Amino acid sequence: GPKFPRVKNWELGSITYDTLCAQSQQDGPCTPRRCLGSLVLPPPAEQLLSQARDFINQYYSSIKRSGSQAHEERLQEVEAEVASTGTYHLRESELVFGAKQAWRNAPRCVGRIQWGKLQVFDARDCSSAQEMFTYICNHIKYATNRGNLRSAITVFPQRAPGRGDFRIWNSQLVRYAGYRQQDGSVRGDPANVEITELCIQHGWTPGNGRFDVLPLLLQAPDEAPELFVLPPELVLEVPLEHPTLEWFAALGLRWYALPAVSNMLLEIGGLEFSAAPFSGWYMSTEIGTRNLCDPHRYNILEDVAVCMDLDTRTTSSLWKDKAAVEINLAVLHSFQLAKVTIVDHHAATVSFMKHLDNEQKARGGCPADWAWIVPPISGSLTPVFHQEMVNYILSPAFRYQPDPW
Template identity: 65%
Template sequence: MVLQQGFTQDCCEEEGDSSDWDEPENELRTIRGDSTAVGFSNVHKGIRQSSWDVFVECSQAWRTGILFVIVPMFSNVLRLNSPAHMSRWEQVQKEVKATDTYHLTETELVFGAKLAWRNSVRCIGRIQWSKLQVFDCRYVTTTSGMFEALCNHIKYSTNKGNIRSAITVFPQRTDGKHDFKVWNPQLLSYAGYKNPDGSILGDPANVEFTEECIKLGWKPSRTQWDILPLVLSANGHDPDYFDLPQELVLQVPLTHPTFDWFEKLQLRWYALPAVSGMLFDCGGLEFTAAPFNGWYMITEIGCRNLCDVQRLNMLEPVALRMGLDTRTPFTLWKDKALVEVNYAVLHSFQSRNITIVDHHTASETFMKHYENELRLRNGCPADWVWIVPPLSGSVTPVFHQEMAHYQLKPSYNYQLFGHALSRRIKATVLYATETGKSEMYAKKLNEIFGHAFNSQVYCLDDYDISSIEHEALILVVTSTFGNGDPPENGEVFAQNLYALKMNDSSGLTNGHDKFSMASSKSFIKANSQTELACQHTERRLDRLESLRGSVSDVMSEDTFGPLSNVRFAVFALGSSAYPNFCAFGKYVDNLLGELGGERLLKLAQGDEMCGQEQAFRKWAPEVFRVACETFCLDDDDTFLEATIALKSPTLSASTVRFMETKAEPMDAGIIEFIIFLIPTSTFVKKINKKIIFKCVFLSSALSKCHNKKVSTCNVAGAFNLHGDNA
C-alpha cells in the first residue's frame, strides 16, 4: 500500500517501526506496522500518536485505506487533530466496527476524486486536477438512473465544445455481489463489425464489445461511425443497454487546412474522451462505476486512434494521397503522413472552437505541474512511457525528464473485467515439461477453458500445493521423462502430493529435500499398486460412476479425502518407445483420485510416436464439455467458440510463406502417377473438362523454397534405438 500523506519521523520512531530515515527527502519511505507495509512521502507534519492509535483500533481491512482520504483532507485545510477531525475518526471507527465498512461524506468523496486524478501516473494533463467536477450519484439504484446520470455528465462535460472535466460516482462495492458497472471502456466509442471476408467496418478495437451489445439486443445501423450504446449494470443485476441520443454526442468531421482531399476521406471523431471502465479506489473503498473525462490531446486521436495499425490504420491511405513513396522507409513517408493527420485533427477541433491541446503545450504544462509537485509533495509519480507523446517525443521536455513510477492512493485503477472473472468458476491448468510440449498443450487448454472459466496456467514447480484443497477444477498436462521419471519441474509437486496422501503435513517441501519417490521404479511400483488396489475396491471417483452409485456408496468414508471438493482430469504425454509409457501422468492421476478428487474423464494419453496431437484435440473439447456440464455452464455458443481454438490455422500470407511457381508440362510418369491415385472415371471426366493436373516433386519444391539443392535418397534401414537389440 502507498500512502500519500503520512506520519512524522517522531511518530514512527515511537511506534518502533521506522526504517531508512536517512534517505533523501524525495525518496519513497517505508514503515512496517503489524503485517502491513505502508509507503509515504513525508509532507504533512504533526499527526499525533493518538491519531495512529485510533487508526490501529480499526479493523485490518480498513485501517490503511481510511487514512488515504480523511487524514490528507484535514491536513489540507490545516485542521489536523482538530475536534472535527477527531470526531470524524470516532464516527468512522464505530461504523467500521458495526458494519465492516463505512461511507465517505460528500466532501471526502470530492477531495478523494480530485486527489486520485492528481495521483494518476499516466495522465499528462494533471495540472487541472483541482478543477474536477464531481457528481455524487451514490443514491442511484437502477440502470435507468445510471443512464440519466451519465447523459447529464456527457451534456455537462461537452458544454457545446468548451470541454469541462468531470466524474460521476455510483455506489461503492459492498460484498462483491451487488456491483454497479459501466461495461463500456469509454462512454463514447465507435462500433466495430467483422465482415465475412475478415475485414473490419468501424473501429477494430471494439469488435468484441460490439458483438456483445448485439447479443443483448442492440440493433445497429452497421455504418463506419455507429456510436455504441451504454451497457450498464446496477446492484449486481444483468446488464442493460441504452442508446445515446445523437444530439448528445458531439462529433468533429476532420478536414485539413491545405489538403482539400482530406475531407473526402470522411474521417471524424467524438469530442469527449470519457474513460468509464476504471475502478475508483478511495479511502479503502472501491467504486466500480466512476466514469470521468478530461479533454483530448491531438496525438490521442491523430496517432493512436486513426493511425495505429490495430485501429483505423489510416497512415498509408493518407501517404498515398499525399503522393509519397510508401515502398521504402527511406522517404520517411510514415513520419510525414503522421504529422499531417495530427495537423488535421488540431485544425478541425480549433476551427469549431472545441477544446483540444497539442502535445507540446501539454508537455510544458506537465513540467510545471511536476515542479510544483516536487516542491509541495517531494515527488510526482509518473509513467514515462505514457507521459511522453507518441509524436515528436524527443523534442518535448518530458522526454528528457527522469520519472519515478509508484502508486499513490486514492487512485483510478484498471479493472480489466477482473470482477467479472471472479464470478466465474476457477480452473487451474498445471503442467510439467522437459521439452516444452506439455507447456504448449497446457496454454492451449487454458485458452479453451478461458471461454467459460476463470482459467489460469501454472508450471508444477511454481504451484503452491497448499492451494490444491481449495481448487474447484484442476487440469494436469504432464510428460514423463526417461524411463518413468517426472520432469524436473514436477518432482517437488509429486513429493508434496505424496506427502498429502500420507497425511504428513511436515512432508511438504520447498524442493531442498531429497525426493523420496523420484525414481522411475518408485513411480512404476506406485502405479501398479494403485491399479491393483482399484480392482479390489468400489470407490466411485469417476464422475459418471458416482452418478450411478447409491447414496450410501457415495457417502461412504472411502470417497472422502482432502480433495473431495476438487474435480480433475489428466492428459499424460509420453513415448511408447519407452517401456514405462506415461508413468508420471498415471501416478498423478492415481494420487489425485486416491486423495478424494472427482475424475471428470479417465486418464488420456498422448503418444509421441503416434497421434499425440490428435489425442489432445480429441480430449480437450471433451473435458471442456464435461466440465461445463459439471458446473452447470452448458452453452452451445461458448462450446463452439472454445473448440475453434483447437482448429488448425488457415493457410494465409500471415501464417505461411507463399511462393509463385510456373506451370510446367507433365511427363508420362506423372500422368501415370495421377491415374494410379485417382479413379479412372473421375480422371477422364476432369480431362474432358480440360482441367490440368499439376504435380511437383517434393525435392523440387523444397529446393525452390529454401533456395538450396535438395536430393532424394532411399532409406537403407531403420533401427529402434530403444529396443532390446539397441
C-alpha cells in the same frame, strides 16, 4: 546526499529529489532484478481501517486540521462504522477531495495540471440502470458544454458487501463500433470488437459504418446489464479536415469530442467505486496518432500517404512520419475550427512540466510514468522526454478492474 530517488532533467541540468514516493503504500511490478515499467497491465476490516485512517489523515491535512477534535472524531466515527457494518461512507467533501487526489495521483495522465479543476458529481444515490443513464447523460451534457469542455467525474454507489457492483461495461462513454467482417478484417474501430459483439448479444441492432456510436451497457447491482442508446445530439463529433490538403475532408474521418473513461475503479480510503466515469478533453496525438494510425486501430497511415503521394515502398522516405504529422495537424485544425477544446502534445507537455514543478513544491514529488507521458510522435521535441520521472502508486487512485463478463 538525500536518501531519496534523485531525479534529473537533462535539458536544463536541474536536479530534484522525490520524497513523495515515501508515501506509497502499494507495490508496483518492478524489482531490483528486473524493471517491468513498460508493461501496460502487470476487505479484511483491519485492512479497510488502516486504509480509511490514512485517507482521513490525508483529508484533514488538506484542510489543515490534522490532530484536531474533528479529525479525531471522524477517525472514531469511521472505526465505529466499520466495526458495525464492515464498511463506511464518505462525507461529500471527502468524496470531492478523494476524486481529485485520485486524478492528481494518476502516473499516466499528462493532463494533471488541471487536477484542482474537476467537477465531481455525486451519484451515490443511484438505484437503477435507467438512473445511471440519466446521470451519465447529465455528465455528458455538462462536460461537453457545446465544445467548451469541462473535466468531470460522476461517482456511483461504492461496492457493497454481499451485493452486486454498479458497472459500466463500455471502456468509454463514447466508442465507435467495430464490426468483424466475413474476410476477417474489421470495419470501424477494432479496439471495440468485443464490446460491439456484447451490445449485439444484448439486443442492439448493429449499423455498418466506420463511425457508428455504441450504446451503453449499464449494470445495476445483481441485474443483467440494460442497453441505452445515447441521443445523437448529446454526442458532439468533429469532422476532420486539413488546413491545406483539400482532399483530406473527403476521407470522411471524424472523432468524438469527449474522452470519458468509464471502466476504471476509483479507490478512496479502501472504498471501491466500480462505476465512476470521468472525462476531460483530448490531447491531439491520442486521436491523430494512436486512434487513427495504430496498426491495430483505424490504421489510416497508408491511405493518407498514398493521397499525399509519398513513397510507401521504402521506410527511408519517412512517409509514415510525414502522414502522421498531417493527420495530427488535421485533428488540431478541425477541433479548433469547430470550437471544441483540444490540446496539442507540445502545449500539453509544457503544462505537465509546470505541473511537476508545482507538485515538487507542494508534495516533494510527482508519480509519473515516462512511457505514457512522453507523446507517441515527436517525443524528444517535447520537454518531458528529457525529464527523468519516478513511478509509484499513491492512493486515492484509479485502478484497472476485471471486465464484468
